[PDB]
């Protein structure tokens, strides 16, 4: 199972690595994908995870997208894990960046509460533009499941645990 993680709360798990290299290790039930509206998966963890799956992530991603449209802001769906994990739970945060209500990053992470235990990267941090520190309080507050976060910037991980609480 999940190794070399510093628990923060009694169900919130965090760990300085790349989420990508930590679910080829684990092959998690489910790993998290912060997705957008469209799921076009092009940077960020989103580039990432497709790329491992070589693009397979993409192309199942945009037969999604033709049969459902897109997803809502602060929403999700499954989709397979291919190669990474059981399943990819895609939740959309809100991107800070395109003028999203930051409000909706609960409503984002109660979508992990459906899901007994998540490998996941901190949402709306990154290229969706809201403060990481603040994401980790929302995710804290709102996630009830086993969440091991995976944080890529040692900087930002070494951040976040010793602001936390
Ligand atoms: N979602 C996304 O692309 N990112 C948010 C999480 C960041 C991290 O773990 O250091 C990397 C960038």
């Given at each position: 199972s999940f190794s070399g993680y510093l628990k923060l709360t009694d169900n919130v798990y965090i760990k300085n690595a790349d989420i990508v290299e930590e679910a080829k290790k684990v092959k998690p039930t489910v790993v998290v994908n912060a997705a957008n509206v469209y799921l076009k998966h092009g940077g960020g963890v989103a580039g990432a995870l497709n790329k491992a799956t070589n693009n397979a992530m993409?192309?199942?991603?945009?037969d999604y997208?033709?049969?459902?449209?897109?997803?809502?802001?602060?929403?999700?769906?499954?989709?397979?894990?291919?190669?990474?994990?059981?399943?990819?739970?895609?939740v959309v945060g809100p991107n800070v960046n395109k003028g999203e209500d930051i409000?909706?990053?609960?409503?984002?992470?109660?979508?992990?509460?459906?899901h007994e235990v998540?490998?996941?990267?901190?949402?709306?941090?990154?290229?969706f533009?809201?403060?990481?520190?603040?994401?980790?309080?929302?995710?804290?507050?709102?996630?009830?499941?086993?969440?091991?976060?995976?944080?890529?910037?040692?900087?930002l991980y070494d951040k976040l645990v010793s602001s936390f609480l």
């Amino acid at each position: 199972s999940f190794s070399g993680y510093l628990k923060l709360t009694d169900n919130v798990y965090i760990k300085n690595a790349d989420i990508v290299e930590e679910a080829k290790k684990v092959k998690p039930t489910v790993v998290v994908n912060a997705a957008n509206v469209y799921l076009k998966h092009g940077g960020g963890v989103a580039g990432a995870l497709n790329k491992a799956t070589n693009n397979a992530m993409q192309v199942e991603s945009d037969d999604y997208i033709a049969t459902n449209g897109p997803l809502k802001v602060g929403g999700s769906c499954v989709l397979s894990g291919h190669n990474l994990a059981k399943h990819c739970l895609h939740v959309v945060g809100p991107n800070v960046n395109k003028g999203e209500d930051i409000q909706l990053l609960k409503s984002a992470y109660e979508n992990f509460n459906q899901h007994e235990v998540l490998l996941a990267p901190l949402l709306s941090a990154g290229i969706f533009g809201a403060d990481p520190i603040h994401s980790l309080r929302v995710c804290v507050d709102t996630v009830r499941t086993n969440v091991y976060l995976a944080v890529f910037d040692k900087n930002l991980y070494d951040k976040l645990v010793s602001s936390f609480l």
